[PDB]
């Protein structure tokens, strides 16, 4: 909502507060959001 | 609805059943949040949307010609009938997959 | 690292697009051409 614009390919997700002002595309990739964690070596290895 | 009376007639009485489901639901929501009437009726020749002879089978023949506004059901978005009706944003992904046992 | 959990706010990505633009509908066909003819799906398969 600016000047040289004109487009953006970036990863945009679809939301109601954005599609009023602007309008998308067709998807061209679905996806949704998860919960990433970390991870440590198991310590049942009957090491004693 | 619209049934064939027997199968030899070609007459019919436009029964009442009330139908339900899951898109249904989204109909209703739709219905209350926007403030509108429906008349929600089924379709009576073929099923879906295939084009033959410039010539549609019901459905999306159903929308092209303006004898019912609005489509609402299990319609596959796809290239050919996107440049004749018009979408809207998906709610459900979708697919082709594989079903061997 | 591992990723757990299930998706949820399932939504789709997709070009950007400003007010209304004569370029609306062909960006529009041709993502959906593209999508039906396996080639986004062999890109992402090579690129991811």
Redesign the interface.
Known sequence: ?SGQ???????????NERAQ???????????????????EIPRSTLDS | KFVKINNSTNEGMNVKKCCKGFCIDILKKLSRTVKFTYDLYLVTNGKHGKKVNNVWNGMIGEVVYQRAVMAVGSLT???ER??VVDFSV?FV?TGISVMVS | ????????????????????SP??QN???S???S??NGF?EDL?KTWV
């Open positions: 909502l614009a004109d487009m953006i390919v970036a990863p945009l997700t679809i939301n002002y602007i309008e998308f595309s067709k998807p061209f990739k679905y996806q949704g959001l998860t919960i990433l964690v970390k991870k | 978005i796809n290239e996107s440049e998906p992904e | 690292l591992v990723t757990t959990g299930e998706l949820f706010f399932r939504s789709g990505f997709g070009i950007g697009m400003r007010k209304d370029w609306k960006v529009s066909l993502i959906l051409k999508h039906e986004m992402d």
